[model samples]
Target chain A: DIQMTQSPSSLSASVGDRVTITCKASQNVGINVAWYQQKPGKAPKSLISSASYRYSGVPSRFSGSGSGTDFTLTISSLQPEDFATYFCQQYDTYPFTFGQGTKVEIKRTVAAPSVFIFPPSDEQLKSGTASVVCLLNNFYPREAKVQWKVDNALQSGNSQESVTEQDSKDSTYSLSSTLTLSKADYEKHKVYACEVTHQGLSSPVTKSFNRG
Target chain B: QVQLVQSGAEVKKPGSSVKVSCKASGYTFTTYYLHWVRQAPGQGLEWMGWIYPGNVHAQYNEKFKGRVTITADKSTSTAYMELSSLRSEDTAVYYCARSWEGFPYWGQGTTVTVSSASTKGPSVFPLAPSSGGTAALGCLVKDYFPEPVTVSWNSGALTSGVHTFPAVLQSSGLYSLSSVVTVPSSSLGTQTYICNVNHKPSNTKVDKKVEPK
Candidate 1:
């Protein structure tokens, strides 16, 4: 089996900075590598393929080059939103392998995180199992803590946190968390809150949803 | 809108076999190849192999060859992977995907575990060289469950200097791994080449001595 190795692991950058990351294969990959970007809470988006060809719908600022054992992915002008994790994969061989992700983060901190909770689906409400997602946006420093509440009391619910991402337009950071609850609890508990605490905020950011 | 829906999880005892299913929909099933992938706990994705339902043709990743059996049903637009002689190491999620639209459309994964089983070691065979002062050795590991094992060669403290080739899957859904080690002909008379087979399930470590005939 062929092995893949990545470098630097992660780096911190600011908006407008040119960023580059590289992946090296144990043997000649014959330009069969691809690049992908994975924003927090979303599946990976294909960026570049066949070594250097950008995938359809990908931005022009994202470019890839090199072939054989060595490959590089360069962002011409790092937009605020481009600050996320990037990965490289080799398709030329069987048992495809992925490179360790390269995370690009902003060097300077800016805004406090904001929170919003998406309504549960109708089926979930009817089925007795509902999932609540809290979208945390416009935050800075990329670090925060999330706490779930039910009827003004702390609730230990099954939850997952997404990777942190910086908004392309504002350079602010964003992410999301999900909590699963039973429908019986949904009707019993009148209020549900997604509370987030960040270094930039004086108090925790809390967004609540009421079920009547 | 192409989708591959897979079967539910399964629990089987060692020496027992089970066949999992993957049903396809939202597209012409026979138009594309159906591939299977495996993901062990805390491990990366592994391409088990693929089969073209249209033609009943199949191909396996070198690692998965023979240890896994992939088949498809055109009538039902479903595919199946039957793993024989289950083992604990086989406990992992298996997914099926369709290959056509660049990105493989995947199905929900199925998990299979082997609760009670035993391990089998490889049979080492030594072959004579054609003309040179080197020897050829082959190690064949078959009918082993948990589907993952390692075979290597060592003479005293000397490790295999050359590249050890991967194992080849057999028609019996077993594994046959071959490795050729060329040592100085002069040492052939006095040296003992050890074929080491390490299988974790049965806590088996087999060392077979290969003596030139």
Candidate 2:
């Protein structure tokens, strides 16, 4: 399966501003690109499908382009509704995956995210496994990098599953990820941390938890 | 790793209801959302809805609104969808998928066929009527629609003297048939024989135990 990455992780734009989001696939995806717009607490709405064909009822301001591994979604004139998050997906292969997503904000200064970690439940530890969650709250410019480490050793294959949100009264953004490991590892008193790096921050923010 | 296996197909009347089950393994079932997808006969696919097992939250496609209901059992690691007041248009293969954002794992698909045709499952009766060097064990299948049923004994253990009679159409528009198998009388008392009958259109299977003296 191919992974999709959208450039300009986020942008500050105003109404009537022309905006374009670029998507790159790990491999050739032909014309299988699809673009969607998602608002907070709402389902994603399809903007364009089959790479370049705008779905019916989508505003004419939105257009899709490109073939093969690179694709583009252009907003000829950004609207209030268009200021939300956008995503590109590839259906050319199995497990059609979505891009990291691009958020179009209404021109604001970068706001660094505050990291928070939730302690795993004791009931879960009794069952021999524990689920840990990390939150990246009140961030701007959307783009961010995250990594997990245990006792100074990198935890490979530990990818992030994030749900982006922007409430009606808030202009900032938020997302979260979760990790799970054996309770035995927790008992070993090993240090576990989720390091978050954002463009607004001079350095990565590390949140850690451990035994005792 | 994630694995999902759905229940088999079903045949129902137009005004009736049908529920499909998807059993999950290799992962925590409650951690993911289960999306139900529908593919009409020879038609394109449609999104029915999804249920977030972690919080028991649900959402549906506008088209479905969802005349559908999705639920799950954490103890069984199974998800279920109940589509009520079915119509002919509801005849399609329904699938349950994991991770609503993108369907990386899918069920094998349970086909629900809503029709007005004469549909009935076979009634099976196992009997040992004759005893000799070999025991004559018979399985009578009665009142089933859409001809043809496969008969077997203990999963093909007794192949010789396996005589399956032709299906006879009855006045009720249903069909009936019988299959007889000869098993060694020596093994009759020591071994247990099972008669299996499969009726396709009805998506029904019958297993009856036959003990011969």
Candidate 3:
């Protein structure tokens, strides 16, 4: 019930340097741990809490230290939105666990993409058939370009693009693109978009699909 | 604004069964404790269990004990997750979170998809040494419909000892991994240690071997 063991799964600094990240806990998870920061499509903020506290508009250069089974998530300087990926959950016990991430990269960077829309399955929305997924995340140079539209016209039948993952340490990239709908675009729920077009953006970065 | 809001995308079929909700707003929702998370698609988060709307009291996750069901209402602060028969790997997205002090309130997910097909693999659980020569290898991936998996570790050329840890999601939903190698009684009789277990929705690939008595 207590088994977090994160380590150098990734690292690469810049913006002021200073990184630190660790998480060893298989027994005494005293300070209970908890540090998260998942940029790339958002929804994962909670810098430190218990294993050090901090969390309230977070960012004092982030900080967190050990207790019981070692913990640490320092980031004294680094910022450019501080790279990305980092996890460490472990609220003492009860099915709470995480820490298979670390990724704090930088090199050749170009950040700006962010999209997330996954909805439509109930057998593709009741047999009418529909599919969607456009993750994109923390853009950088790995070549991006996902496009799809429905009521807004442009349509395309089946599509799939996922390969560029790299973000364990540097060269940043995180992709996803799957748009398959039909049956009259799933009964005209229409308005489904996903633009993105990274080259370090100057535009392109849309988002729409909101089915639940 | 301490929100939570959930429930929306759900496409059920297989064995059929679904229930999803999460309301919580502003704060003071029974003081806190809602939990319930799962993210099958690409896969990464899974917690499936928790409820305590002051007294609705609950807690499951031996991989989702008995399938799943964590209810609560506290009048309307809401929180629910039914899940049952359903398959097609039980599709996924769920999410409720709200245990504050460490959950930071969450709940904007609820995708649930389940059309058919089912698989289920992983079981390995033997190596459990523990006296300095270290060793712990464990695995128990159950009821496989789908969601994502890849727990690995296969030291053939002595991969700098061994550690691997991460793949903990049990509440009945299934997935429990543990890896710990470090058997130095001089390579525990010529090194072996293997524990790979990838389950890309059934393209299973089990492996187990960490003998060192």
Candidate 4:
């Protein structure tokens, strides 16, 4: 997938600003543009698609209209639910791309939490034997891109299962992937990371997990 | 035609860590990105981020900025995400999502409780078989904190009335959810009721049918 980014990384607008963001495909994946929104600690909600068709069960005010390389996501009258952050994605090719994201912070700026997770550490790549699980969560559409690596080197072969959300509010389902390793692979592969990439931004971000 | 089947529920202690999975079927996994969402106990849905299988680039909802990590495996058509430092506040049901353009479609709900004790709760009934054989009905989920959910009957002529529920056990950011609806057996014998899960990142639905024993 090619790298993708969003302009005005973050923006602030009142009731009506005709807010718009441009999602350029790496080369030209045709005309597959989508927009989504996320509020505080909540899930992202889709607003427009294919260019500008309002999905079923969605409000008419939230409209998307455009096509091909140049496209637009518009909100005629932004409601409180529409105040969350918004992102754009292009699905015209493999390795899809997403915009950096534009947060529509309405009301007062809500301070987001800053706690993160850090895996274990090892000085050298050790060799041994054991089995472990790579659990997946809170993901949607199943069009997700995930890769497994050993000590920074990409590893091949993996297994996966499909899962969905049991609650309302969220319209998409979730999925999980599993990569098993033997004692030898565990020791030989000192560190592991599941890299997730998409055309949604300038570059891909990866998360690493040290051998336990 | 596109569908996602998620896993069961999880109960963890405040200081522990856990990972959940959602697998996709009937579509090209690598062709699109899978998004993550969170619904705290008794709260609304939150968009955590998205992951692609090819290279591992994930996005975070500023709120989930550092609390969660998302990954995917293209070969097997599945996506994964993990949450560390499982606090009670993070004890709500997490979900995997998908979106086309801007509107989202989703899967069934998964309940995650952050607690060390075991408990049994009550069920909210939505429909009952009408007198003299004409209907079979069951309750849909209605009492999820933040906002109760809504249920729509599909494939049959239906009649509905106010649905009320009682209080249930819960942890911070988490709540129990169940709803119900009534369908006439006369209008249609074999019909399905679709329970729509409305949340951010996307919306999801589950179907159940009515039958006579």
Candidate 5:
């Protein structure tokens, strides 16, 4: 029963800069620390384990250090792909815990997403199924959360595993996701919602289809 | 109009099993694939496994193969996942998603908190006698694990002049906490107020009221 605390919480840096995140465990965790890196809308993957072992395929610029109650995940030279949240997890005991996470953001202004929800297509409807698409267009910094909600509660999974397209012209990104239902059920329980969260927006950009 | 609705959060004891249900609407349930994913507190998602309703064929990730099972009911258009032999590591938000459609739709996740390890309900102490105008109504909730419990007075939330402390982990791998509430000084103070302690893992509700001695 140990708790992990992460430092800085978030930081902003430019490309080729150096940044380090630290984790502190209430008790000695020894070498049981594993670091995870998470990109927006993507599942986190292991980057470092046993406090220092970098898993194969991980870049050399990223390194882990320390042991026991104190540990660190340092990016010697930050790259564009390194701008994501980092977390340290300790598996020393039961009820393994994780640090609060350090979100590494690029030094730039955040932009809000323009969200839209398209109703079911007629082709799918005629075939007994209904299809709806949620579009999140043109957002800066590229990190956004896209999820669906039926009725009121938030649903799981990211957009279509989500297609994030960067606009080369403006350096923003767009995401699209779709939800399909049976036409029979659509007639009775048609409540689809899309919420897009970004640093630019105070609250998530929301759009929904609730005709039923 | 496809929809995947799931159950709410659940609390279970150690070594027990839990089944989270996800009911579908608006689509041919058999035509789509149901996949399970889990997210622990402050962690990212981990793919659990998937099931097909058409034939009830299921597959699991090696990480959860022995401990998790996915089943579907054509009659109810519902998908269920049973995580057996539960432990603290299994405490997470279980999500059911439609992966056949390239993970387009997902059920509102069902959170299951495995209140594992050892648990013991509160062994409440008697309310202290009034000093000046305030009486100290206190109870001791000790030796419980998982660090989640509810202590209330008169079957409601804590009201004014109530002091509740956080649970402290003991060396014995258990927890201890205490709460004291101030009430109008009792005149006929043989036995008065009740302290209700809810320990979900143990499925015990301790209603502490001093018996006349």
Candidate 6:
């Protein structure tokens, strides 16, 4: 097993910028390795493996190549959807090792925009279960928070788990939250909101949901 | 889909350690989480830790507390794990899996043998000298995917002090496991040496002797 060390704990990049991360082993562990991307709360996504294999669901733009002691992860064409944090790892040994992480933010950020949401579709209420899913398009720093407001008031609907996934190299991130409402509230509840907060921008961002 | 083809068996003694590597194929190097697990000479599997190849952040199990480290080189799609502080209890086959907790994955386990008190080292390696300034031993296996086999000394007396010889992996299309131990010729003959195997079905352990000329 080799002690894996990753560099550039954090980085700043704009859209369409190329990003790279390097990982090395303490000794000559050779090419047994992989790379992963993780946002805040969602399950980590696979980006590369076996020194260079891409997982099934990953986008084609994200790529990796290297051998033996040296390796690299690159995002050729960065998109707003490709912002978040990146991590590297080596699995050539028993106790796997990982790099700290590189957080990527906009090169120059301005204001944190407010967000709004769309109410569940009529199909959703007819099914007896309505959902409010919030998606965050991009991020700056710090962390974001979300809440559900009904009739301009906080509703006690069942809040589903929140998921966040971002690409550190691209400086863009996505987060989603779902609120499952009972059959009664599914049809009656009029307003809902998904709020995002972070130090990267100016103020808290919120998204309100409205029925279609 | 992704697959790992690893090395074969290794032999060592009681007081030494070994390191093994898993070569990955089928997918890109920096896509998923590469994880390492431990299985005793004849036991079930234990979660060790996982590494995200892209970001390279790792988490470990308390049980493995201090004995091992996992790493990777995305350039080569190879994930590596090293085991140290060789005790017979530490003898087990090791494996590198794609997911920290997901199974039904592919992995080829490499084996290491630790020889008890003996008079000769492994057949692939040369015996230690009486004085023990710098020694190089070697092991080579065959049938490993994309290569025949490459061997080297990774830890303890072999890794420290002297410079390391280059290690090479030649494709044999099958699986082969090998290792080399470097130690002081005097201590080599007296102190116990271990071959650490990081593989599956349970990590296997073998023992051998180190003879001095």
Top candidate when judged by DockQ against the true structure = 3
Best by TM-score: 1
Per-model interface RMSD values are: 25.8, 24.2, 18.8, 19.3, 24.2, 27.7
- Ten contiguous residues minimizing lDDT sum, candidate 1 chain A: A161-170
* DockQ, all models: 0.03, 0.01, 0.10, 0.06, 0.01, 0.01
Candidate 5's TM-score reads 0.38
**Alpha-carbon runs more than 4 Å astray in model 6:** A1-9, A13-114, A139-142, A155-157, A161-170, A196-212, B1-213
How many angstroms is residue A189 displaced in model 1 relative to the true structure, after the best TM-score fit? 41
Q: What pairs collide in candidate 1?
A: A81-A168, A128-A183, B14-B116, B65-B169
TM-score of 2: 0.37
What are the Cα lDDT values of the candidates?
Answer: 0.67, 0.72, 0.67, 0.52, 0.69, 0.55
Given the true complex, what DockQ would model 2 score?
0.01
lDDT of 2 by residue, A9-110 (tens): 887787789999999999998998888776543335678878888776778999999999999999998877777888887777654556877878776678
In order of listing, the candidates' clash counts read 4, 0, 19, 116, 5, 118
User: In model 5 chain A, which range of ten residues has the least summed lDDT?
Assistant: A158-167
DockQ of 3: 0.10
| Tens digits of lDDT, candidate 5, B105-160 | 66778778676455565444443322245444456565576557888876775465
What tens-digit string does per-residue lDDT give for candidate 1 at A42-96? 3346688788888767899999999889999999999867877887877786766
The whole-model C-alpha lDDT of candidate 6 against the native structure comes to 0.55
CAPRI tier of model 4: incorrect
Of the candidates shown, which would achieve the greatest lDDT relative to the real structure? 2
Worst 10 residues of 6 chain A by lDDT: A161-170
- Using lDDT as the measure, name the better of candidate 3 and candidate 5: 5
lDDT of 4 by residue, B9-114 (tens): 7777787877778888888788776877666644334556788667678876665667778888788777777887787678677778775553265545456767
lDDT per residue (tens digit) for residues A118-187 in model 6: 3444433565655554444345442566766766776553564322333344333434455656678766
